[PDB]
Amino acid sequence: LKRNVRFHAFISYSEHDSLWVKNELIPNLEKEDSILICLYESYFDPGKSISENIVSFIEKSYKSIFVLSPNFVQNEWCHYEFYFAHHNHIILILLEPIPFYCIPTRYHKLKALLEKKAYLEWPKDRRKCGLFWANLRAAIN
Amino acid sequence: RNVRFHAFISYSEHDSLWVKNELIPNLEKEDGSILICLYESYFDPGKSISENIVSFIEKSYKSIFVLSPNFVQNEWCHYEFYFAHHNLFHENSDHIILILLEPIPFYEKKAYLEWPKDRRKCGLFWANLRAAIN
């Protein structure tokens, strides 16, 4: 049972995937147009440690959405390893395919989620985007 | 050659008392206006965590890492990407200064500045530290 929840959703992403996050994902979440979104750019508090911020992001949010891509894995994931090495609610989107061979060996839980395909794949085919968003809303509620 | 700071200091907040009452004052004691980059003051969430760290390091003449069990257990995971990237496990970099504030039991080999157990060698430690940053 979660404590001091201040946000419906935390969105974790590479700034290189900004345009999708801010032009596609957030507009679709603000379809309860009252929804409170935690984003690093607006709530990282340098008065706390990096890890304490990341813990607050996930634990003060009903859901955490991770926008997975080669950029996220190569540049951002390293700051979440301390969390997920000991923790198992969490929504994974595969925005862009990740070749298994570029994923660092130590990212065990990541590589296993990818293997069993526990994620929502963003379709590059635009007629399939409806199904995507439908699956996302079923996942969050 | 395009630096903004003399020294960036990376440290665990559990070691902040030593940082703010010993480290910083002694660097300031023989250099009143020394320019110091702290994460708490210069973090820019307009940039990524790694991009912030990279900027702290590149913009500082020297980078001082305050190593301790507290640092290793809480902070090292966010800085390893820099060290792993610049191969600083097999090779040295002249702008990085490591301070072993408190021993790390194994449960870089030997190029650090050890904080002395004997209070009488604190003068010497600060002499060594000023040599490293100037």
UniProtKB/Swiss-Prot annotation, chain B:
Expression sites by tissue: Highly expressed in spleen, lymph node, thymus, tonsil and at lower levels in lung. Highly expressed in promyelocytic HL-60 cells and in B-cell lines.
Subunit structure: Binds MYD88 via their respective TIR domains. Homodimer (Potential).
Family: Belongs to the Toll-like receptor family.
Name of the protein this chain belongs to: Toll-like receptor 10
Side Cytoplasmic, residues: 1-134
Function comment: Participates in the innate immune response to microbial agents. Acts via MYD88 and TRAF6, leading to NF-kappa-B activation, cytokine secretion and the inflammatory response.
Subcellular location: Membrane
Domain TIR: 3-133
